[PDB]
């Protein structure tokens, strides 16, 4: 037998504290599967946590019921989910392909979207958008939202813009008007 | 004995390179504890790293002295800390309940706050705020800070705002004034 | 022999599903190395994944070919790389010293920079800058970019600025002009 993978099924009864269908399954070459029913399905994938699933080549899923559902996807946290080339960090964090979701219950539903913060959310129809902050939600594609229906946030420590597509600060607004 | 957990105490002397009160402790059903004195205290929790601690149900703590102190909390990095439903990524990263801290020494002190970047910091009294960037610090609640006492940053690649609560760029400021 | 580290070399043939120069190497006291050729080189470092490398004291590297190249660095994902005190999350994510890179192929090339989003990029000469969003790229130091050469994004849910260095929204621009 050619040993290239690491498969570690339960080896202890938590009611006794002694280490010696809950088998872990490392099916890919060089893969790693650790924990009750944990499964690393393809090449070099890593799955650590009860019921964790790393379905993609080189995918990484850590946390109970965490699932990396595509190649290279990475998930960290209980019930976190990430599609191909995505990143989902935090319990219940979820991201569509090539997206980034960081925070408890964060959701990057649009492909390539970014959702940072608890319950931050980029709706599936808001392409290439970003939601930043607790409960921040996008309302359109090609945008960055720093708030939601019941909260608008001020943006601080902004240096005056110079190029046409640079943001403008209060001092700048006043100055330009004065002159 | 019903084996549902994975408990892996030290199995090698780094001075010899041979693998065979530093015992790891997987106390929860389906939990995983790997490393010198590592402890996963509750159901399905995961603790990997010397002195790592996952105290909450479904919590995940990886890194030496990393500690997930509440249910569903996730921590990654040396001495990283996260309260319930929080996310702390990076050495010394710390977050209060339901917050997000990413970066070395990042601190999301206010509940539900977000701190991204080295030494980024949302003070405990700045509710629902966000700090973005190296050393960025918030100065008030309900805000997003992209700088600190000795640094204001310009915001670039901003498309002209349309709705009342959209940001304004330089070209837009000039245009509106001209007319 | 004084057992303080965890070293787990391949223990299964994925073609058989049975768990019993690909040896793992836990060289540091309290270190953890799991997976084919995985190596945790210094004190308390953690390396999980085929070919993973944690070279720094207290560093953490998880994912195939993932490498934490400096003290306290943390990396998560296939081929992710992070220098000292850095954070790199996502396959191919890369960060220079004390930086943060989150997202597939994200690159925080400037020290202390932050790159969040798929292929987000802060060039090495753009000190202390941040790039937010899919393909967002900075074009200067001390800045925050929310777009790139072929995409400018609108910023939404912005509350009117009050301090001189606060951002201005559309309603505010109109109001000030009117008066």
Report residue A177: phi and psi, to 5°. -65, -50
Residues 67-106 in A contacting C (C-alpha not used; CB under 8 Å): 72-74, 76, 85-87, 89, 98-100, 102
Helix (H, G, I), strand (E, B) or coil at C18: strand
Helical ranges in B9-142 per DSSP H: none
CATH number at residue C1: 2.150.10.10
For A114, counting Cβ atoms within 10 Å of its Cβ (0-12 exposed, 13-18 middle, 19+ buried), the class is buried
Query: Which chains reach chain A with 3 or more Cβ–Cβ distances below 8 angstroms?
Result: B, C
Q: CB B146 to CB A158 under 8 A? A: yes
For the record, the structure tokens of A8 come out as 């570690």
Contact, B27 vs B38, CB < 8 A?
no
Closest CA to A103 of C130, B88, C40, C110: B88
Contact, C126 vs C112, CB < 8 A?
no
Q: How far is the C-alpha of B123 from the C-alpha of A26, rounded, in Å? A: 44
Torsion of CA C83, C89, C93, C98, to 10 degrees: -30
Q: How many residues does chain B have?
A: 179
Contact, C143 vs C130, CB < 8 A?
yes
Report how many Cβ contacts below 8 Å link chain A to chain B: 248
Nearest CA in chain B to A64: B44
Report in angstroms the alpha-carbon separations of A137 from A92, A107, A144, A149.
17, 10, 9, 8
For the record, the structure tokens of A162 come out as 């110079």
Q: CB A48 to CB C49 under 8 A? A: no
Closest CA to C9 of A43, C20, B48, B30: C20
Pairing of strands B12-13, B18-19: antiparallel
Residue B62 with chain A: CB contacts under 8 Å: 62
Residues 108-147 in A contacting B (C-alpha not used; CB under 8 Å): 116-118, 132-135, 142, 146-147
Helix (H, G, I), strand (E, B) or coil at A107: strand
Helix (H, G, I), strand (E, B) or coil at B160: coil
Residue C93 with chain A: CB contacts under 8 Å: 87
- Under the phi-then-psi rule, with left for phi > 0, alpha for psi from -120 to 50, and beta for the rest, what region is C35? left
Which residues are C95's β-sheet partners? C82, C108
Q: How far is the C-alpha of C74 from the C-alpha of C56, rounded, in Å? A: 10
Put simply, whether A22 touches B (Cβ < 8 Å) is yes
Residue that has been written with the tokens 């074009």 in this structure: C139
Q: How far is the C-alpha of B108 from the C-alpha of C152, rounded, in Å? A: 29
Crossing angle of helices B170-178 and C170-178, in 10° steps, is 30
Put simply, whether A164 touches B (Cβ < 8 Å) is yes
Mutate to test the interface with A, among B1, B2, B6 (most CBs of A within 10 A): B6
Contact residues for C160 (Cβ-Cβ < 8 A; gap 6+): A154, C168, C169, C171, C172
Q: How far is the C-alpha of C62 from the C-alpha of C54, rounded, in Å? A: 9
Contact, B63 vs A46, CB < 8 A?
no
Q: CB B19 to CB C8 under 8 A? A: yes
Helix (H, G, I), strand (E, B) or coil at A178: helix
Contact, B106 vs B118, CB < 8 A?
yes
Q: Measured between CA atoms, how close is A151 to chain C, in angstroms?
A: 7
Report in angstroms the alpha-carbon separations of C45 from B46, B77, C2, C94.
17, 10, 18, 19
Q: How far is the C-alpha of C87 from the C-alpha of A9, rounded, in Å? A: 30
Helical ranges in chain C per DSSP H: 170-178
For the record, the structure tokens of A105 come out as 């219950």
Report how many Cβ contacts below 8 Å link chain B to chain C: 248
In angstroms, how far apart are the furthest CA atoms of chain C? 81
Give me the residue from B4, B98, B151 closest to A118, CB to CB: B98
Contact, A142 vs A125, CB < 8 A?
no
Q: CB C12 to CB A3 under 8 A? A: yes
The DSSP symbol for A117 reads: S
Q: How far is the C-alpha of B127 from the C-alpha of B108, rounded, in Å? A: 10
Q: How far is the C-alpha of B27 from the C-alpha of A14, rounded, in Å? A: 5
Contact residues for A62 (Cβ-Cβ < 8 A; gap 6+): A46, A47, A48, A49, A52, A75, A76, A77, B46, B60, B62, C62
Q: CB B3 to CB A11 under 8 A? A: yes
- Under the phi-then-psi rule, with left for phi > 0, alpha for psi from -120 to 50, and beta for the rest, what region is A92? left
Contact, B18 vs B33, CB < 8 A?
no
Contact, A29 vs B25, CB < 8 A?
no
Report how many Cβ contacts below 8 Å link chain A to chain C: 248
Instruction: Report the 3 state secondary structure along C59-74.
Output: CEEECCCCEECCCCCE
Contact residues for C88 (Cβ-Cβ < 8 A; gap 6+): C73, C74, C75, C76, C77, C80, C81, C82, C94, C95, C100, C101, C102, C106, C108
For the record, the structure tokens of A156 come out as 């601080």
Contact residues for A141 (Cβ-Cβ < 8 A; gap 6+): A110, A125, A126, A127, A128, A129
The DSSP symbol for B73 reads: -
Report residue A118: phi and psi, to 5°. -55, 125
Q: How far is the C-alpha of C152 from the C-alpha of B131, rounded, in Å? A: 22
Q: CB C48 to CB B49 under 8 A? A: no
Domain count, chain A: 1
Q: Which domain holds residue A110?
A: 1-179
Q: How far is the C-alpha of C96 from the C-alpha of C112, rounded, in Å? A: 7
Q: Measured between CA atoms, how close is B118 to chain A, in angstroms?
A: 16
Contact, A65 vs B57, CB < 8 A?
no
Report residue C177: phi and psi, to 5°. -65, -50
Closest CA to A87 of C34, C85, B107, C75: C75
Put simply, whether B174 touches A (Cβ < 8 Å) is yes
Closest CA to A36 of A46, A28, A47, A45: A47
Of chain B, the end-to-end C-alpha distance in Å amounts to 81
Torsion of CA A32, A37, A42, A48, to 10 degrees: -40
Q: CB C59 to CB B78 under 8 A? A: yes
Contact, B79 vs B62, CB < 8 A?
no
Closest CA to B132 of A166, C118, A146, C83: A146
Mutate to test the interface with B, among A47, A78, A127, A138 (most CBs of B within 10 A): A78
Q: How was this structure determined?
A: X-ray
Within 13 A of B171's CA, how many CA atoms are on the CB side? 11
């Amino acid at each position: 037998p050619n040993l290239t993978a690491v498969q570690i099924s339960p080896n202890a009864d938590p009611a006794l504290g002694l280490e010696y269908g809950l088998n872990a399954s490392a099916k890919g070459i060089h893969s790693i599967a650790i924990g009750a029913t944990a499964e690393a399905a393809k090449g070099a994938a890593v799955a650590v946590g009860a019921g964790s699933i790393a379905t993609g080549v080189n995918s990484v899923a850590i946390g109970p019921l965490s699932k990396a559902l595509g190649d290279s996807a990475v998930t960290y946290g209980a019930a976190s989910t990430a599609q191909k080339d995505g990143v989902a960090i935090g319990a219940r964090a979820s991201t569509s392909d090539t997206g980034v979701a960081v925070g408890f219950n964060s959701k990057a539903d649009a492909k390539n979207s970014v959702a940072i913060g608890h319950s931050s959310h980029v709706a599936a129809n808001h392409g290439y958008s970003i939601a930043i902050g607790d409960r921040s939600k996008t309302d359109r594609e090609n945008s960055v939202s720093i708030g939601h229906e019941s909260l608008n946030r001020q943006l601080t420590h902004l240096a005056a813009g110079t190029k046409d597509t640079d943001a403008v600060n209060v001092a700048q607004l006043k100055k330009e008007i004065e002159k």
